[PDB]
Amino acid sequence: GKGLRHFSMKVCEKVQRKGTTSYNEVADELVSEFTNSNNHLAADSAYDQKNIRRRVYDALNVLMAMNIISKEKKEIKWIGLP
Template sequence: MSSGGMPGGAPTKIINVGASCQSNHGMNHTASHQENARNAVVERAAKKKRESRIIGGGLRQFSVIVCQKLQSKVRTTYNQVADEIIADFAGTHSDTIVPLESDEKNIRRRVYDALNVLMAMDIIARDKKEIWWKGLPETNMKDLEELKALRAEMMNRIGKKVAYMKDIEEQIVGLQNLMARNRQLLECGSASPEGRFSLPFLLVQFTLLLA
């Protein structure tokens, strides 16, 4: 009887249990690593989406929100505006957890940027911590009509100058063609003395305007 057989002469198939366990462990480790990577990607995407909602579509849209807050309060501070916008965001997005510290910092940074934009446009004024509303720039209808009339007048003047320059160009081209023709006749010897002009001479040109 051989050491590797069973009674009756049937060969025994020896399974390497250690190698099989090691292979399964490696597969499980790889699957776990892939799952962690997928979770990290999903988490980053969710965070980016949350930040984009906080920003409100961009600095322009966020400036409108800040502008509305300031207009309703007339006088306020930077912290009051930022705190109210953070509270409004938390109430609007009730499906999310209370805003994280990074989200609050992002909102406060956007409020600060929006305030600088509004100050540059002379819509608000600031003295130390206090901010007050000055008002949106008003466009008078009379001023608007005057600007439209001025624009129409300028466009009319530009059109006349363009037409004048085109007429001058046509005159120059005509004189150049006449000079080339006379030069060619002179070189060929076919120019008659009667057709010549003695210098200096006066050329008179007029334009007939039909009503």
């Protein structure tokens, strides 16, 4: 639904599927998907967008430290799970 745990999975899928990408491409697409959820209310998009945005930094950063992805001066690249 939400929470770091649910967004880290979104993040990790996105990056592998794109091979190479950026913070903004990742975040904008997660925001857009959450926002087009059938059970979502328009009044709540600005919050949410902000919140998903802060969440993505936390995910990228541990994922980074696990050597699962790249992130080198705005360029984020996939690597692999273990």
